[PDB]
Amino acid sequence: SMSYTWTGALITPCAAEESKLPINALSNSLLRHHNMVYATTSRSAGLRQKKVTFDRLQVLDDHYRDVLKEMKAKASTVKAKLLSVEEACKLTPPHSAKSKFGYGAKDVRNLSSKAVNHIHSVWKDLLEDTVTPIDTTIMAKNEVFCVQPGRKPARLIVFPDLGVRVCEKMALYDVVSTLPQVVMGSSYGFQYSPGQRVEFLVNTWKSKKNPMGFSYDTRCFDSTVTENDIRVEESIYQCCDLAPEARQAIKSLTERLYIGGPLTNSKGQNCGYRRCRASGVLTTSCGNTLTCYLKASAACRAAKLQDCTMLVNGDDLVVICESAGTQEDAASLRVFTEAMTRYSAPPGDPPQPEYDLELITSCSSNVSVAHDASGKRVYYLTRDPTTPLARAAWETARHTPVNSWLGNIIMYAPTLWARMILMTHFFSILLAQEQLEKALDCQIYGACYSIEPLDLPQIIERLHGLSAFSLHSYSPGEINRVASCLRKLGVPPLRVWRHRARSVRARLLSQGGRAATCGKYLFNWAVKTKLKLTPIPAASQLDLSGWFVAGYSGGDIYH
Ligand SMILES: CC(C)(C)[C@H]1C(O)=C(C2=NS(=O)(=O)c3c(CNS(C)(=O)=O)cccc32)C(=O)N1Cc1ccc(F)c(Cl)c1
Numbered sequence: 001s002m003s004y005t006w007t008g009a010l011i012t013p014c015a016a017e018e019s020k021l022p023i024n025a026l027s028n029s030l031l032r033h034h035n036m037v038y039a040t041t042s043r044s045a046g047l048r049q050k051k052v053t054f055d056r057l058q059v060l061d062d063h064y065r066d067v068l069k070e071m072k073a074k075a076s077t078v079k080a081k082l083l084s085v086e087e088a089c090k091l092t093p094p095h096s097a098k099s100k101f102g103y104g105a106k107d108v109r110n111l112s113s114k115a116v117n118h119i120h121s122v123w124k125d126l127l128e129d130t131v132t133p134i135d136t137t138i139m140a141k142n143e144v145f146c147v148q149p150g151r152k153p154a155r156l157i158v159f160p161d162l163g164v165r166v167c168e169k170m171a172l173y174d175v176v177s178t179l180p181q182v183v184m185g186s187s188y189g190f191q192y193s194p195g196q197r198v199e200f201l202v203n204t205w206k207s208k209k210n211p212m213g214f215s216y217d218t219r220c221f222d223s224t225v226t227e228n229d230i231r232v233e234e235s236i237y238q239c240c241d242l243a244p245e246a247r248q249a250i251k252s253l254t255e256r257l258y259i260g261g262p263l264t265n266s267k268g269q270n271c272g273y274r275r276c277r278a279s280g281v282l283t284t285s286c287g288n289t290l291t292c293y294l295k296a297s298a299a300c301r302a303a304k305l306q307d308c309t310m311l312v313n314g315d316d317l318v319v320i321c322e323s324a325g326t327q328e329d330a331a332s333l334r335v336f337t338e339a340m341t342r343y344s345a346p347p348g349d350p351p352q353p354e355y356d357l358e359l360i361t362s363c364s365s366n367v368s369v370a371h372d373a374s375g376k377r378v379y380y381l382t383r384d385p386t387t388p389l390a391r392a393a394w395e396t397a398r399h400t401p402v403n404s405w406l407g408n409i410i411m412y413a414p415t416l417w418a419r420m421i422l423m424t425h426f427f428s429i430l431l432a433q434e435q436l437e438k439a440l441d442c443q444i445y446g447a448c449y450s451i452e453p454l455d456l457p458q459i460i461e462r463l464h465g466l467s468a469f470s471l472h473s474y475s476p477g478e479i480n481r482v483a484s485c486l487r488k489l490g491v492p493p494l495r496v497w498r499h500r501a502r503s504v505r506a507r508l509l510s511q512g513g514r515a516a517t518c519g520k521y522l523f524n525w526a527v528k529t530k531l532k533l534t535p536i537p538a539a540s541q542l543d544l545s546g547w548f549v550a551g552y553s554g555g556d557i558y559h
Pocket of ligand 1: 192285313365382407444445551552554
């Protein structure tokens with residue numbers, strides 16, 4: 001069937017949308033080439049609609065059903081619980097979209113009786129009615145990029161009312177938090193810190209006699225998801241040991257929301273109908289991960305890839321296997337792709353075999369190597385810093401709900417671009433505003449986290465190790481990619497950043513306490529006469545539970 005049917009009604013914004021890079025007094029210290037930076041708006045939604053709208057055909061074979069059976073066997077070992085209304089309410093981001101029924105996120109969060117009453121009413125209706133399609137809003141996402149000589153159209157987000165979103169948590173939060181690791185084991189990617197992911201990638205790579213690897217880019221994964229896939233997902237959820245009410249609600253959410261339903265714009269006009277994955281439901285991450293792992297695991301068998309190890313984060317897939325040499329690897333991957341295509345996950349750009357781990361991009365990241373304090377080689381994950389820096393420029397001039405810069409510093413802390421540019425720039429800004437103590441929101445694996453900037457040294461230590469504060473002798477390939485980015489964007493040379501970082505560090509040191517700790521660890525690279533970095537005390541008090549358990553993209557989750 002068609003992924004979507006459209007009425008002609010337009011996808012509408014809630015507020016005016018800026019597409020041009022806002023400029024303030026801080027902008028130029030980061031980036032001179034402002035016209036290279038843009039944000040998507042709803043006004044390009046028609047271009048997206050076009051490309052996410054196609055017919056899906058699905059041909060399912062024995063490998064498919066075999067893998068599914070294995071997945072269900074493991075799923076049946078999971079026991080999951082219902083969350084109370086209040087438990088589910090506390091998982092709601094403060095900035096979440098408000099209900100059409102006269103209450104908002106903060107009402108939910110502080111448990112107003114108005115919110116809670118509507119929630120209980122939504123739940124009761126889920127138990128009673130397992131057929132009536134549930135309403136969703138379709139919006140365009142405003143995301144920032146750099147011009148790639150041209151522009152990406154806005155992504156679409158499809159989400160049900162707040163009342164329904166709290167109910168999803170009640171029925172499925174424990175499931176989507178617990179099931180994927182039990183079903184998929186070490187192949188489930190959202191369980192890893194950056195440190196663990198690079199560890200798992202390197203160990204996997206060198207466990208092969210002659211390693212070959214490839215990332216598989218599905219063309220618009222969400223759109224490729226069929227009703228079959230979503231019913232198949234539900235059948236996996238139902239293997240779990242669940243309370244009768246959770247079973248009923250899960251069945252009801254599947255039939256009424258997950259499978260499809262009507263699409264309404266912000267003005268309340270009907271825009272059409274969806275028959276593929278909604279990107280803004282609780283099950284998007286878990287559903288996509290299970291479905292990608294199933295199709296890929298079965299496609300590996302069909303292609304006869306040898307010792308194929310998968311790493312799956314939603315729709316993001318990387319496979320590492322044994323080479324049969326270049327001719328056979330190329331033919332293998334074609335069989336893999338034909339299978340995936342038969343399963344309704346055709347590729348965007350065709351996959352290509354890789355023989356160098358560092359040339360493989362997965363979760364928009366590639367492995368690279370640097371050296372630590374004692375010369376002892378260390379692997380870490382990095383990326384082309386263009387988009388992170390284009391977004392950092394936007395966020396320098398505009399207050400954003402989610403600070404991408406903060407998530408990039410957290411996840412890319414060991415990189416030369418994050419240490420030298422992002423750390424230096426934003427700590428300078430926090431200092432000027434005396435907002436070092438001010439807790440800031442960022443999204444990691446789709447979930448929103450409130451973070452104190454001053455806890456960054458502890459956070460980085462836990463996620464990457466001390467190495468992250470002592471890394472040097474980065475690779476010519478990486479150094480060239482950074483330098484090329486700065487040239488393109490008109491970002492000041494690294495000597496300018498080194499100069500600035502010295503100032504930032506000194507200023508932090510002068511401050512004392514946690515701020516001096518930020519000065520010492522984060523900016524030890526800037527000083528020629530290096531200080532000794534010991535393991536950070538009282539770091540092992542702060543619990544990073546909720547971190548690196550599961551993915552929740554589009555799932556309206558707050559920790
Ligand atoms: C915060 C950033 C930097 C953005 C982080 C992230 O949170 C993600 C992600 N967040 S997400 O939206 O949950 C996500 C998906 C979600 N896809 S889906 C709809 O659920 O099917 C897939 C891949 C990756 C993601 C990511 O790729 N990242 C890059 C990255 C990932 C893992 C690492 F170990 C390192 Cl070092 C860097």
